[PDB]
Scaffold this active site. Structure first.
Site, PDB file in Angstrom:
ATOM      1  N   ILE A  14       0.850  -1.460  -0.094  1.00  0.00           N
ATOM      2  CA  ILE A  14      -0.011  -0.232   0.076  1.00  0.00           C
ATOM      3  C   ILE A  14       0.919   1.405  -0.020  1.00  0.00           C
ATOM      4  O   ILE A  14       0.297   2.294  -0.098  1.00  0.00           O
ATOM      5  CB  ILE A  14      -0.956   0.182   1.254  1.00  0.00           C
ATOM      6  CG1 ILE A  14      -0.307  -0.043   2.422  1.00  0.00           C
ATOM      7  CG2 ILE A  14      -2.047  -1.112   0.940  1.00  0.00           C
ATOM      8  CD1 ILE A  14      -1.239   0.074   3.630  1.00  0.00           C
ATOM      9  N   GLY A  15       2.117   1.174   0.075  1.00  0.00           N
ATOM     10  CA  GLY A  15       3.040   2.362   0.142  1.00  0.00           C
ATOM     11  C   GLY A  15       4.581   2.116   0.337  1.00  0.00           C
ATOM     12  O   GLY A  15       4.863   0.879   0.619  1.00  0.00           O
ATOM     13  N   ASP A  21       8.748  -0.887   2.870  1.00  0.00           N
ATOM     14  CA  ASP A  21       7.611  -0.637   2.203  1.00  0.00           C
ATOM     15  C   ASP A  21       6.603  -1.126   3.370  1.00  0.00           C
ATOM     16  O   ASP A  21       6.612  -1.784   4.331  1.00  0.00           O
ATOM     17  CB  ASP A  21       7.515  -1.777   0.937  1.00  0.00           C
ATOM     18  CG  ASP A  21       8.521  -1.163   0.032  1.00  0.00           C
ATOM     19  OD1 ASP A  21       8.707  -0.156  -0.250  1.00  0.00           O
ATOM     20  OD2 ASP A  21       8.948  -2.207  -0.720  1.00  0.00           O
ATOM     21  N   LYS A  37       4.643  -2.468   8.109  1.00  0.00           N
ATOM     22  CA  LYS A  37       5.917  -1.960   7.604  1.00  0.00           C
ATOM     23  C   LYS A  37       6.842  -3.148   7.811  1.00  0.00           C
ATOM     24  O   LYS A  37       6.998  -3.578   8.971  1.00  0.00           O
ATOM     25  CB  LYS A  37       6.550  -1.060   8.414  1.00  0.00           C
ATOM     26  CG  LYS A  37       7.678  -0.148   7.833  1.00  0.00           C
ATOM     27  CD  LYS A  37       7.695   1.476   8.332  1.00  0.00           C
ATOM     28  CE  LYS A  37       9.056   1.958   7.612  1.00  0.00           C
ATOM     29  NZ  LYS A  37       9.178   3.306   8.003  1.00  0.00           N
ATOM     30  N   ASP A 127      11.674  15.128   8.137  1.00  0.00           N
ATOM     31  CA  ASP A 127      10.863  14.703   7.134  1.00  0.00           C
ATOM     32  C   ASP A 127       9.493  15.016   6.966  1.00  0.00           C
ATOM     33  O   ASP A 127       8.532  14.226   6.525  1.00  0.00           O
ATOM     34  CB  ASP A 127      11.051  13.047   6.500  1.00  0.00           C
ATOM     35  CG  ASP A 127      10.889  12.981   5.058  1.00  0.00           C
ATOM     36  OD1 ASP A 127      11.112  14.018   4.230  1.00  0.00           O
ATOM     37  OD2 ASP A 127      10.830  11.875   4.700  1.00  0.00           O
TER      38      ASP A 127
END
EC number: 2.7.11.1
Length: 290
Positions: A14-15, A21, A37, A127
């Site tokens: 999903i990302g 990932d 994750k 970030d």
């Protein structure tokens, strides 16, 4: 059936996040959807365990997702995360890359507070970008969450509050497009830099783009040089032309903070609150997408 532990069914990607990932997860029993994750263990510098520790130190804060560190199934470190709603970039796209001033300011109030909270727990995020803010679900669909602590760093000692020293930066860096000028100059990030990056995020929402997006055929590492040079050559007053002056005041304030200063988070929120109220808006959490 491929599961994390015995509880979370593993699904499709999903990302992406820092150093690993993200995959969709389904509590086999509870039915609740989670994000999982994964970090490959084949690295001399692993990060996911550290990241889980930071999330745990932040737990209970408004807009901080709940996580579960699960250690290493075979070749992967695993962290299970609360699944949230769409990111602010996703919602920007659902809104055809136009947010109203009211929505930008509703978001700004909460994002300054999220950053303040992380700082209150002795970390800088490093970030700050649209994809690291997401809306909650259900009852909490009006709440802006901040995610991803893989690049986060302690800026002061937890017991003494002794600030990290002013030095050339050592650690890995976040996105070039939202980086502070100090980051481009190679200086260690502190609280001021997180807030400066948020200023670029807000102006991105106002504009649809930043003047340093769009690049040249080059090595990519040149590409970072291009972003740096355009950002440094673009005055805050040019960047913010045609938007309420509070966005320019916000950015000038963040750039003028001393490295170890405690930012006046209240001042920065109050700039936007008084602008919001002068337009007759209410903090009623009715965003464009509602």
């Amino acid at each position: 059936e491929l599961r994390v532990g015995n509880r979370y069914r593993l699904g499709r990607k999903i990302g992406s996040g820092s150093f690993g990932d993200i995959y969709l997860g389904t509590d086999i029993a509870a039915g609740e959807e989670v994000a999982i994750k994964l970090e490959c263990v084949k690295t001399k510098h692993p990060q996911l365990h550290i990241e889980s520790k930071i999330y745990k130190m932040m737990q209970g804060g408004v807009g901080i997702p709940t996580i579960r560190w699960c250690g290493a199934e075979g070749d992967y470190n695993v962290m299970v995360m609360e699944l949230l709603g769409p990111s602010l970039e996703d919602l920007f796209n659902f809104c055809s890359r136009k947010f109203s001033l009211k929505t930008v300011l509703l978001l700004a109030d909460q994002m300054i507070s999220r950053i303040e909270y992380i700082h209150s727990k002795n970390f800088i995020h490093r970030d700050v970008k649209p994809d690291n803010f997401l809306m909650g679900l259900g009852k909490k669909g009006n709440l802006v969450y901040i995610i991803d602590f893989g690049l986060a760093k302690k800026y002061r000692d937890a017991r003494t509050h002794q600030h990290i020293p002013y030095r050339e930066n050592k650690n890995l860096t976040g996105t070039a497009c939202y980086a502070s000028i100090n980051t481009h100059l190679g200086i260690e990030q502190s609280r001021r830099d997180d807030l400066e990056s948020l200023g670029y995020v807000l102006m991105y929402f106002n504009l649809g783009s930043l003047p340093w997006q769009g690049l040249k055929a080059a090595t990519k590492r040149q590409k970072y040089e291009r972003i740096s040079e355009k950002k440094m050559s673009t005055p805050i007053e040019v960047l913010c032309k045609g938007y309420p002056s509070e966005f320019a005041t916000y950015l000038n304030f963040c750039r003028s903070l001393r490295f170890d200063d405690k930012p006046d988070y209240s001042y920065l929120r109050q700039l936007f609150r008084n602008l919001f109220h002068r337009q007759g808006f209410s903090y009623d959490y009715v965003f464009d997408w509602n």
